[PDB]
Amino acid sequence: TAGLAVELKQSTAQAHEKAEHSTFMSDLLKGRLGVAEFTRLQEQAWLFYTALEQAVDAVRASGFAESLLDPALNRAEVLARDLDKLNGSSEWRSRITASPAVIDYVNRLEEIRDNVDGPALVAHHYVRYLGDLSAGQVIARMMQRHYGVDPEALGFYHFEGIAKLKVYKDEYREKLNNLELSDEQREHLLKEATDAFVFNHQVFADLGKG
Numbered sequence: 001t002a003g004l005a006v007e008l009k010q011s012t013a014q015a016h017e018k019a020e021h022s023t024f025m026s027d028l029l030k031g032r033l034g035v036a037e038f039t040r041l042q043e044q045a046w047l048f049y050t051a052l053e054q055a056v057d058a059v060r061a062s063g064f065a066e067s068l069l070d071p072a073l074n075r076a077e078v079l080a081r082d083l084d085k086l087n088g089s090s091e092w093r094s095r096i097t098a099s100p101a102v103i104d105y106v107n108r109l110e111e112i113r114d115n116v117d118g119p120a121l122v123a124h125h126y127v128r129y130l131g132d133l134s135a136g137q138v139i140a141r142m143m144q145r146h147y148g149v150d151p152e153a154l155g156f157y158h159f160e161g162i163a164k165l166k167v168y169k170d171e172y173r174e175k176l177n178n179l180e181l182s183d184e185q186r187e188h189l190l191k192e193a194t195d196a197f198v199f200n201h202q203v204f205a206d207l208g209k210g
């Protein structure tokens with residue numbers, strides 16, 4: 001009754017805290033790593049965003065939650081543009097390989113794609129895109145300040161088509177509240193949001209491990 005958006009934020013709050021406190025992300029954001037480690041992160045993100053956006057496309061094409069699944073949110077192509085700049089070459093696409101965590105995350109996203117699992121997809125959409133909308137300005141500024149990354153290579157963190165980010169985030173949360181879901185679908189979505197945070201935490205863990 002608080003609304004699905006508020007339940008999601010409460011349910012995932014601890015997982016969000018654990019992700020912020022992960023050693024790799026904490027070290028990266030504090031300036032203790034470098035542009036190389038930042039670029040390795042963006043490469044792994046390109047892999048899972050590519051899979052996520054295949055799943056989004058399939059669910060949108062099935063007619064589920066179409067207005068929530070705004071294609072302007074797509075991050076895979078802008079990540080590739082950033083990586084072409086960061087690596088000074090397009091050849092990173094033929095050099096990178098998924099970490100074990102990314103393999104697992106991509107496997108889940110491909111099952112969601114194949115099953116056209118709308119509620120599961122919405123959970124992953126919330127976990128990635130609402131986080132991106134919330135954190136992009138602060139993370140981009142940290143990469144620029146600590147590592148000298150030019151804003152031209154921080155496009156992943158920017159949504160130039162969204163004139164008022166807060167208005168958009170509030171509208172996005174209201175679209176979540178407005179979804180019509182059965183009790184099973186709602187519980188499935190909430191459980192998948194927890195799983196989505198775990199997948200993302202493990203991407204950071206793998207990056208920290210090397």
Ligand code: COH
Nearest residue numbers: 008009019020025126127128130131134135138139200201
């Ligand atoms: C720059 C620090 C930082 C990091 C490392 C970080 C790491 C991650 C991460 C990595 C696993 C994921 C999946 C997310 C996902 C989210 N983050 Co952040 N977030 C971060 C800064 C924020 C900020 C700031 C907000 C808005 C306030 C809040 O809810 O915490 C945020 C909010 C979110 C929200 C929206 C909550 C809501 O309003 O319902 C999601 C989803 N997230 N975040």
Ligand SMILES: [Cl-]
Nearest residue numbers: 074075076077
């Ligand atoms: Cl894209």
